[PDB]
Design a protein around this ligand. Structure first.
Ligand SMILES: *Cc1c(COP(=O)(O)O)cnc(C)c1O
Ligand SMILES: *Cc1c(COP(=O)(O)O)cnc(C)c1O
Ligand SMILES: CSCCC(=O)C(=O)O
Ligand SMILES: CSCCC(=O)C(=O)O
Lengths: 368, 367
């Protein structure tokens, strides 16, 4: 008796693997992304208030309260919102409902750890499109993007703000995509879990330009510093939504109720108390600190416009040697690139305390 | 642009759709099974202690504490335990790991609405194996079981205490089933979310007869009256575990940290405080009460051995036409069987207050 060949895709993600390596080595974890602080008090109290009164099942699509709250933020009706057990389940169930054997899916590179595996588990094939790493940071070359479409291609998967690059797609760029989308009738899947986490002008969502074909993915845990709550969501044309609620219902049924209840209150409060504004500033401060401290170490640093990840190049090192000898953990570029990853490109996470970032800066320092 | 054909199965499940109808109609919801009371105090307290301390990502396989708590209850080691976002995810991930294009999966009948869709979504066939229905009650047939076994069969999928029959499989039958599996070199998927909800005698576990190929599935929701916590588990041979964690990794990454944290303490407190003991007590009453009350009316009632459900026969009736006039929710057998499902067989659910049980009978009587 042997497992089905499909299970060849079930390999320990690099993120949780390095997190274990770090505790074991007493290293500073700047790898897997998750805040070192607890989530805001209003979320915790909202969850506390839900325990003992909203502990049982919830409609597969989500608690009405949560849907209504997402509806307002997005300016859509409740029917167009489906609450999943994390953005992770949103992405899996999405690809699952949009591609299959013989179908192609464009995926920008470097990509996010869950895409390819999700694609493969659906049957589709990865149409990687490597962004250029010019001395001014990454950038999408629409020509190279365009040269990658075919009669098979049934969908395009975007990530903005982008993990791990930190790139924020600009208006003109989104047009070009919503455009190409329509031209070949391609589906649009936008991973925007970091929608509220940007450091410049407020980005323009992608559903604006190509509403009829856009699926926008978000995460409560990436919004409210509570990555362990597993409450995510899909927002797209209401006609398809009912099926998606059908899919995710076989995968896990519905998200945790008391957590769905708490996030519901928390999303509205957050919009009223200016929580996202403060969070962004707290992140910009730590972004500049890390990037600035690395700069002083004559390293090449590519300042991000969004998310709490940043990319730098450390000459002549590799994750596993760095974690053991410098006591600092990082995610190696080869985790995002399917082939030939820019040697010496590492990803730093700065959703940590100022003291952890400094500790990393000092340890990396005396290891010239 | 159209959604991939696979979505054929992505059809709203009956249970949440009937609860919406029941609710909306002001009808007693003895359909979808979920307790009317809140989870025990020691589970809420423990979750509360976790909020603020354990809110970030846990490992895909699960929180060390939880895996260890389960490891002790099942007499195995942590590595053979993988925590899932509810049992529902156990099943999905499971069937998706043992069968694909070309494989077949034996399934008993009546079934749990998740079974075929999963098999279906796995790209494999799921030949059924209906059970009998003598006056005594349901009945298994190792013969039919023995027959459905073809060369393409990769695994069987048991479920005891069985939902929706309340049937608690006996030792000789498990063992009998164990034999088949080892002979044909099959996998055994045991859905045991109701392992602690039995009205009879401490039921034996399949894994005691074929521990080398049996995957046991459980659920904190069913054990602890907290169905919305979405914390479940798969306990199987350690050699296959690293893979199962890798599959669920891609589905929902890992279960809710605070809930996993709280369930971990609760599983231990439960044994100690004799919680399960008493949970079985109160479920007995409500079991007897709801069935006797149906005899007084004069119907065919099958007193279950386990679970908090129970099936009965309602003369020339159906589903929606009931939740409209009688204003009481029930589940028609059409959801458990694929074709030609028994006449007038409706599954209730007595995990409600005594009040709700009574008030459900009244509205039943005047019809
Ligand atoms: C964190 C992350 C996810 C997953 O979010 P969850 O809600 O934790 O499952 C998906 N996509 C990207 C790009 C992420 O950074
Ligand atoms: C409740 C139930 C499930 C699902 O359990 P979750 O932990 O809520 O996902 C699966 N199988 C049976 C027989 C059940 O009764
Ligand atoms: C869900 S694993 C971690 C995902 C993430 O935020 C990361 O890119 O580190
Ligand atoms: C499929 S959600 C409901 C699960 C359950 O307990 C039931 O069968 O009623």
């Amino acid at each position: 008796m042997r497992l089905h060949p499909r299970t060849e895709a079930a390999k320990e993600s690099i993120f949780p693997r390095m997190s274990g390596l770090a505790q074991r080595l007493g290293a500073v974890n700047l790898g897997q992304g998750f805040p070192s602080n607890p989530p805001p008090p209003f979320l915790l109290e909202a969850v506390r208030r839900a325990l003992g009164r909203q502990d049982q099942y919830a409609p597969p699509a989500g608690l009405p309260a949560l849907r209504e709250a997402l509806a307002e933020e997005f300016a859509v009706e409740p029917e167009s919102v489906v609450v999943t057990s994390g953005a992770t389940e949103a992405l899996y169930v999405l690809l699952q409902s949009l591609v299959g054997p013989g179908d192609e899916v464009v995926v920008l590179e470097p990509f996010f750890d869950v895409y390819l595996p999700d694609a493969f588990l659906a049957g589709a094939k990865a149409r990687l499109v490597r962004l250029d790493l010019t001395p001014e940071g990454f950038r999408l070359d629409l020509s190279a993007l365009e040269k990658a479409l075919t009669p098979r291609t049934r969908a395009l998967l975007l990530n903005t703000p982008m993990n791990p690059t930190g790139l924020v797609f600009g208006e003109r760029e989104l047009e070009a995509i919503a455009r190409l989308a329509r031209a070949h009738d391609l589906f649009l899947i936008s991973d925007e879990v970091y929608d509220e986490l940007y450091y410049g002008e407020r980005p323009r969502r992608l559903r604006e330009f190509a509403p009829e074909r856009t699926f926008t993915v978000g995460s409560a845990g990436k919004r409210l510093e509570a990555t362990g709550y597993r409450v995510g969501w899909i927002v797209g044309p209401k006609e398809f939504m009912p099926r998606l609620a059908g899919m995710r219902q076989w995968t896990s049924f519905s998200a945790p109720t008391p957590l769905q209840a708490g996030v519901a209150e928390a999303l509205k409060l957050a919009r009223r108390e200016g929580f996202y504004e403060a969070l962004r500033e707290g992140y910009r401060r730590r972004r500049d600190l890390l990037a600035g401290g690395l700069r002083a170490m004559g390293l090449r640093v590519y300042v991000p416009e969004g998310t709490y990840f940043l990319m730098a190049e450390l000459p002549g090192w590799d994750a596993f040697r760095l974690v053991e000898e410098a006591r600092v953990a990082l995610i190696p570029a080869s985790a995002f690139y399917l082939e030939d990853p820019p040697k010496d490109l590492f990803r730093f996470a700065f959703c940590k305390t100022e003291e952890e970032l400094h500790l990393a800066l000092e340890r990396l320092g005396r290891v010239v």
